Design an enzyme around this catalytic site. Structure first.
Site, PDB file in Angstrom:
ATOM      1  N   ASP A   7       0.880  -1.193   0.000  1.00  0.00           N
ATOM      2  CA  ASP A   7       0.000   0.000   0.000  1.00  0.00           C
ATOM      3  C   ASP A   7       0.911   1.235   0.000  1.00  0.00           C
ATOM      4  O   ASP A   7       1.582   1.514   1.048  1.00  0.00           O
ATOM      5  CB  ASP A   7      -0.915  -0.035   1.206  1.00  0.00           C
ATOM      6  CG  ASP A   7      -1.723   1.232   1.447  1.00  0.00           C
ATOM      7  OD1 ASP A   7      -1.876   1.991   0.495  1.00  0.00           O
ATOM      8  OD2 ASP A   7      -2.146   1.454   2.637  1.00  0.00           O
ATOM      9  N   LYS A  68       2.237  11.450  -3.716  1.00  0.00           N
ATOM     10  CA  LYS A  68       1.141  10.728  -4.384  1.00  0.00           C
ATOM     11  C   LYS A  68       0.188  11.726  -5.085  1.00  0.00           C
ATOM     12  O   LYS A  68      -0.515  11.312  -6.012  1.00  0.00           O
ATOM     13  CB  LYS A  68       0.335   9.880  -3.395  1.00  0.00           C
ATOM     14  CG  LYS A  68      -0.645   8.926  -4.054  1.00  0.00           C
ATOM     15  CD  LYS A  68      -1.103   7.831  -3.093  1.00  0.00           C
ATOM     16  CE  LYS A  68      -2.127   6.873  -3.643  1.00  0.00           C
ATOM     17  NZ  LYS A  68      -2.525   5.876  -2.599  1.00  0.00           N
ATOM     18  N   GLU A 173      -6.854  -0.157  -4.843  1.00  0.00           N
ATOM     19  CA  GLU A 173      -6.965  -0.154  -3.363  1.00  0.00           C
ATOM     20  C   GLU A 173      -8.263  -0.825  -2.903  1.00  0.00           C
ATOM     21  O   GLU A 173      -8.227  -1.718  -2.043  1.00  0.00           O
ATOM     22  CB  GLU A 173      -6.784   1.274  -2.837  1.00  0.00           C
ATOM     23  CG  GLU A 173      -5.336   1.726  -2.950  1.00  0.00           C
ATOM     24  CD  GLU A 173      -5.074   3.208  -2.813  1.00  0.00           C
ATOM     25  OE1 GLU A 173      -5.982   3.929  -2.388  1.00  0.00           O
ATOM     26  OE2 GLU A 173      -3.933   3.620  -3.121  1.00  0.00           O
ATOM     27  N   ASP A 193     -13.208   4.045   2.775  1.00  0.00           N
ATOM     28  CA  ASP A 193     -11.756   4.198   3.006  1.00  0.00           C
ATOM     29  C   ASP A 193     -11.453   5.640   3.385  1.00  0.00           C
ATOM     30  O   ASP A 193     -11.534   6.530   2.510  1.00  0.00           O
ATOM     31  CB  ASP A 193     -11.005   3.787   1.756  1.00  0.00           C
ATOM     32  CG  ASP A 193      -9.503   3.733   1.960  1.00  0.00           C
ATOM     33  OD1 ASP A 193      -9.039   4.279   2.981  1.00  0.00           O
ATOM     34  OD2 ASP A 193      -8.813   3.135   1.082  1.00  0.00           O
TER      35      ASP A 193
END
Ligand SMILES: Nc1ncnc2c1ncn2[C@@H]1O[C@H](COP(=O)(O)OP(=O)(O)NP(=O)(O)O)[C@@H](O)[C@H]1O
Ligand SMILES: [Mg+2]
Length: 381
Positions: A7, A68, A173, A193
């Site tokens: 991850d 990211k 994900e 999430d």
């Protein structure tokens, strides 16, 4: 032959290995099962993970995070223009239009592409696995958000190649989280999430061992950092009322030290009714101390918590399905440990217990690790 799942989080990254159908999430050198997605450059060294995050307030200009949010983007994109107000580090556009992150390292100006910063976090997660296994690791599955475009996916893959990983596959994900829980006909799975930087809701269907992403919604700027900011804003105002209008917000180092302690108190409030925020010599040599009840935290964050249901309603609307048709609600991301968020979601789904047995900030790496083992020919999971 050894394959790991990673991850690569906006805020925190996590590595797992699946062997004999059992998944170990690997602790780093400090005993932490997740590692900050932070890289710092000093006069002497390159710090990655906990050590980088821990000196951020002493070295703000040369401490890189949120790579990211830049990976596989052109510098001119409106998301970059918007996001860069949040960064104390310098980002400029190259002649190819790619972001260049500028730091000082050993007294010299250095520039890095986002995938070079992300390669250093991936290399750290590779080393974490290697220390635990006592053997080199070459193969990995790396996860990305479902909304990532071909440029963001390919730049993430390139980060893996730069880190020395053979990237077996890039997977979503939310799919990784569903794989972790082994999710009998047709099954409707909602992934909720809520991490450090981002909020993603994904509605998946699973017919015959095959996942499809039916609909996605969320907010790229709602996460734990926003709840920390609610505590910071309160404490700044509380200090004013105690110390004759003095304004901590004028000192960026004072805010950062306060933010660090607000995040710690927030975590405590997930398992206690109360927590102390304490900063010795916060601003003008003045000590700061305050007690925050879970009720006060809930009040400060009330709108943000309740608004998490709006993307849930939107993915169900897009998928043309009723909340009663959802078979599993999977809680993913470190912020889903907040009791009030768990209660809001449970109530919305008419008392249905969410799937939260896997530490929510580990579920994506857990799934990636399962997929990595399967793609290495290990059928034990
Ligand atoms: N016990 C807890 N209570 C509340 N928040 C927590 C707890 N433990 C961790 N967190 C928060 O979880 C967040 C990190 O979530 P995590 O899922 O590890 O991030 P990520 O994978 O990088 N996701 P994202 O930042 O959205 O890309 C931080 O904001 C932490 O403060
Ligand atoms: Mg993320």
């Amino acid at each position: 032959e050894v394959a790991i799942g990673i991850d690569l989080g906006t805020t925190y990254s996590c590595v797992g290995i699946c062997r004999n159908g059992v998944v170990d999430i690997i602790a780093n050198d400090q005993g932490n099962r997740t590692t900050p997605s932070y890289v710092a450059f000093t006069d002497t060294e390159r710090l990655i993970g906990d050590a980088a995050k821990n000196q951020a307030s002493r070295n703000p200009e040369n401490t890189v995070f949120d790579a990211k949010r830049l990976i596989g983007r052109k510098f001119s994109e409106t998301t970059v223009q918007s996001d860069m107000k949040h960064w104390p580090f310098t980002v400029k556009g190259g002649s190819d239009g790619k972001p260049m992150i500028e730091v000082s390292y050993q007294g010299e100006k250095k520039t890095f592409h986002p995938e070079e910063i992300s390669s250093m976090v991936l290399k750290k997660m590779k080393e974490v696995a290697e220390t635990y296994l006592g053997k080199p690791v070459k193969n990995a599955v790396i996860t990305v958000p479902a909304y990532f475009n071909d440029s963001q996916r390919q730049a993430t893959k390139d980060a893996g190649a730069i880190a020395g990983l053979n990237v077996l596959r890039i997977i979503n994900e939310p799919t990784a989280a569903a794989i972790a829980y082994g999710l009998g006909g047709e099954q409707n799975i909602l992934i909720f999430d809520l991490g450090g930087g981002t909020f993603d809701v994904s509605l998946l269907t699973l017919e015959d061992g095959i996942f499809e992403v039916k609909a996605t919604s969320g907010d790229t700027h709602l996460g734990g950092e926003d709840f920390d900011n609610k505590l910071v804003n309160f404490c700044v105002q509380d200090f004013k009322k105690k110390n004759g209008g003095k304004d901590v917000s004028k000192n960026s180092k004072s805010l950062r030290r306060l933010r660090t302690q607000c995040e710690k108190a927030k975590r405590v409030l997930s398992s206690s009714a109360q927590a102390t925020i304490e900063v010795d010599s916060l601003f003008d040599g003045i000590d700061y101390n305050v007690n925050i009840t879970r009720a006060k935290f809930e009040e400060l964050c009330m709108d943000q918590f309740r608004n998490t249901l709006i993307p849930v309603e939107k993915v169900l609307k897009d998928a043309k399905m009723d909340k009663s048709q959802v078979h599993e609600i999977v809680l993913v991301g470190g912020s889903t440990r907040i009791p009030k968020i768990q209660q809001l979601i449970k109530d919305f789904f008419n008392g249905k217990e969410p799937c939260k047995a896997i530490n929510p900030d580990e579920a994506v790496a857990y799934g990636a690790a399962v997929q990595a083992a399967i793609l290495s020919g290990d059928q034990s999971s």
